[PDB]
Design a protein around this ligand. Structure first.
Ligand SMILES: O=C(Oc1ccc2c3c(cccc13)C(=O)O2)c1ccc([N+](=O)[O-])cc1
Ligand SMILES: O=C(Oc1ccc2c3c(cccc13)C(=O)O2)c1ccc([N+](=O)[O-])cc1
Ligand SMILES: O=c1ccn([C@H]2C[C@H](O)[C@@H](COP(=O)(O)O)O2)c(=O)[nH]1
Ligand SMILES: O=c1ccn([C@H]2C[C@H](O)[C@@H](COP(=O)(O)O)O2)c(=O)[nH]1
Lengths: 264, 264
């Protein structure tokens, strides 16, 4: 997509040389922002083939509050396998915070229901927010949340959402993350009888791994194709009752997939 | 400042009509981002006079973990008076989360010390973060945190910081908030022996109250003056030992102050 390639070119042109915790080199900038008007089309990158399969399953899994990889195994989704312990536990990651943020006084807070209520009953609110950044639980997570925090906003019948992403692998992670939140905006909007507005992506440490330079140059040689259209085949009774088969993408004509490796 | 007037013009040109919780009308956009290279000068707005007095006292108060207005009363700082109860308690707002975020297991987490340690011992980290968004404690706060969340970043000897601000009154609040975090970057950087990089400001609901239109038009008629320079007169032993008198601003030549009213 224009915005995504622009970010990619920006990091090449402006990135400073920066290592990760493994010591793998990156080119890195700090602070970036992109906007996707969801009425223009579903923002799934076209300059390489991306599959929605794992994105949908992972979102549904988040929404269930499940932190065990079992449901992903049931569907042969393996993207969380590298972080899971021997019983398949990830500690209190995304799903547990979204659906059951624990408080000092023994409660478990369902931030998804909170936000849905707020969107229906108080759409002007400036605090419609879900955070996964539970400071006291970071140590137990297999991973500190990358998409840390998000806010919704309603104006003129349209639902928007902004994500803060503390750390972004622009090549491997970003296309996935964008489509993931865009999906959630479409499900949220449907459940509240709103149309879709903007997904605004904000990044902290926004980087390209040095071993992704050939792929980056290749993708930058390609022209964005028209955006696909998301189809929701069915309207469920709640945000928690979406099924995998509810979602279709039409008009997805991507250039070919490109593989990118990780160091260990 | 260029960036600040640009935002102001943007909200006039692009804001949609939007009420707050009191029902006061605003023009509002969602999602914006500005960058202040702190090496260019301290980003205190010049197109109206702003005083640093209350900004410094409030930051020092935040850094102490104090949530009672008593220390601000000692210095006749009254900006939190409208929210304080009869004993002057604000509930568990900023200071308590920064310095003593409470966990389900009975701990109190000092996020400022955490972040200082990380900046000194692991500056490549992509999770150097302070959050005030403690979901379980929102109900007890006199106010939900406006500056919800912030991340630091080090590259090339330079400390940067990004703030996520869920809600922004561009006319009254924004100049204050910018100078506040810019100050904290200068104190942080000093304590870690780094130079200063960028302050990146990111906003959610970014708005102008309709009863600020005359002031807005007036300020937009003015030309930014050169940025002032922050002087730190002394180097304290820690981030917690700054005193009010440690700070001076040089070369501050602002156009005249402009008053803006609030509805009740
Ligand atoms: O390797 C990663 O671990 C994850 C960290 C955080 C994550 C994921 C998710 C799905 C799959 C992996 C990860 C996810 O939904 O949130 C990773 C995480 C984040 C990104 N990113 O683009 O920021 C890229 C890679
Ligand atoms: O009236 C406000 O209450 C506060 C909300 C959140 C706040 C403050 C602070 C100082 C003084 C007031 C407030 C502050 O440091 O954080 C307010 C808050 C935030 C803004 N803003 O620009 O977002 C403008 C006004
Ligand atoms: O009586 C109230 C008090 C608070 N809020 C919510 C929505 C407001 O947006 C937020 C208070 O902070 P602001 O975002 O409005 O600045 O809390 C209400 O809806 N009603
Ligand atoms: O062995 C480790 C594991 C984690 N981290 C910190 C810094 C990393 O930036 C972050 C892991 O997430 P990333 O931001 O690196 O994606 O946690 C380390 O410093 N060392």
């Amino acid at each position: 997509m224009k915005q995504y390639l622009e970010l990619m070119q920006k990091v090449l042109d402006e990135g400073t040389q920066k290592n990760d915790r493994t010591g793998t080199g990156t080119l890195s900038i700090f602070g970036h922002q992109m906007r996707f008007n969801l009425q223009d089309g579903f923002p799934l990158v076209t300059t390489k083939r991306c599959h929605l399969r794992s994105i949908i399953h992972e979102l549904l899994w988040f929404l269930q509050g499940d932190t065990n990889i079992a449901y992903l195994h049931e569907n042969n989704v393996t993207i969380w396998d590298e972080w899971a312990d021997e019983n398949g536990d990830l500690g209190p990651v995304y799903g547990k915070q979204w659906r059951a943020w624990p408080t000092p006084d023994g409660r478990h807070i369902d931030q998804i229901t909170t936000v849905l209520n707020q969107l229906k009953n108080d759409p002007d609110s400036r605090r419609i927010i879900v955070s996964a950044w539970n400071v006291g639980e970071l140590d137990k997570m297999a991973l500190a949340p990358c998409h840390a925090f998000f806010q919704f906003y309603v104006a003129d019948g349209k639902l928007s959402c902004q994500l803060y992403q503390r750390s972004c692998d622009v090549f491997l992670g970003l296309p996935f993350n964008i489509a993931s939140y865009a999906l959630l905006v479409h499900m949220m909007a449907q459940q509240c009888d709103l149309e879709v507005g903007d997904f605004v992506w904000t990044g902290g440490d926004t980087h390209l791994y040095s071993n992704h330079m050939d792929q980056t140059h290749l993708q930058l040689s390609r022209e964005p194709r028209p955006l696909p259209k998301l189809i929701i085949k069915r309207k469920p009774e709640s945000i928690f009752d979406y099924r995998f088969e509810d979602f279709e993408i039409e008009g997805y004509d991507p250039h070919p997939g490109i593989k990118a490796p990780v160091a260990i």
